Amino acid sequence: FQFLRCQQCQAEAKCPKLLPCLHTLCSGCLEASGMQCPICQAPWPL
Amino acid sequence: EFQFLRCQQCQAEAKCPKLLPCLHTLCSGCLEASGMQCPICQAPWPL
Amino acid sequence: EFQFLRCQQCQAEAKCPKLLPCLHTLCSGCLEASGMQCPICQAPWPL
Amino acid sequence: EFQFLRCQQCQAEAKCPKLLPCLHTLCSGCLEASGMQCPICQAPWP
Ligand SMILES: [Zn+2]
Ligand SMILES: [Zn+2]
Ligand SMILES: [Zn+2]
Ligand SMILES: [Zn+2]
Ligand SMILES: [Zn+2]
Ligand SMILES: [Zn+2]
Ligand SMILES: [Zn+2]
Ligand SMILES: [Zn+2]
């Protein structure tokens, strides 16, 4: 079996985090996202 | 033999859910009441 | 204006998709034609 | 900050879930024990 795919850039997303919007992101896109999802702009908590 | 999806905000049936920018499933009532954003994750509705 | 979901088998509109055991989204036509298993992943339908 | 996904069979953590033909999320333990098909929906493994 392969890993999940990032729904922003379609690279492999090995161990994706649980996000509030349920999107799947690779580490690169998540670290680059700032304060909200790059796909739907759901704000990240804190 | 199969039932409909469930609303992730109120847990009722969501028979014909709309495609939202986030991946959530909402019944029509919860969508109509939501204002400018998803009531679960606050993804803004597209303008 | 929100749109309806898309069938993952034929990519037509799936306005009121049923909840399947595998979580795929199918239009009513593709579900009616499916026989006893999912046309995408072959998850068996209950019975 | 963010937590990881949950296994949909046992509800434990699934840190790095594999892509299955069905859309289910399994921890590695539940996947290793599954045999030739998904333990939730019985979609056959390729
Ligand atoms: Zn990515
Ligand atoms: Zn998102
Ligand atoms: Zn609702
Ligand atoms: Zn949402
Ligand atoms: Zn179809
Ligand atoms: Zn399926
Ligand atoms: Zn498990
Ligand atoms: Zn499954």
| Residue of B47, B10, B1 lying closest to B31 (CA atoms) | B10
Chain D window 2-41: which residues touch A at a Cβ cutoff of 8 Å?
Answer: 2-6, 15-20, 31
What is the nearest CA distance from D13 to chain A, expressed in angstroms? Answer: 11
Annotated binding site of A for Zn(2+): 6, 9, 21, 23, 26, 29, 37, 40
List of long-range contacts for C31-36, beta carbons under 8 Å, 24+ apart: C31/B2
The rounded Å distance from CA A35 to ligand 5 centre is 37
SS (H, E, C) chain C: CCCEEECCCCCCEECCCECCCCCCCCCHHHHHCCCCECCCCCCECCC
Q: Comparing C-alpha atoms, which of C26, A22, D3, C12 is closest to residue B20?
A: A22
Q: What is the DSSP letter of A39?
A: T
Give the distance (Å) from ligand 7 centre to CA of residue D38. 12
User: Alpha helix (H) ranges present in chain D?
Assistant: 28-32
Q: Which residues of D touch C21 (CB under 8 A)?
A: 22, 40-42
CA distance A40 to C44: 34
CA of B42 vs chain A CAs: smallest distance (Å): 5
Cβ(A13)–Cβ(A5) under 8 Å? Answer: yes
Q: How was this structure determined?
A: X-ray
- A28-35 long-range CB contacts below 8 Å, 24 or more apart? none
The SS3 call for residue A28 is: helix
Report the SS3 class of residue B31: helix
- What six digits make up the tokens of D12? 């434990």
C-beta of residue A42 within 8 angstroms of C-beta of residue B42:
yes
Dihedral angle, C-alpha C21, C24, C29, C30, nearest 10 °: -90
- Comparing CA positions, the residue from C35, C15, C17 lying closest to residue C26 is C17
Distance CA C2, CA A22 (A): 19
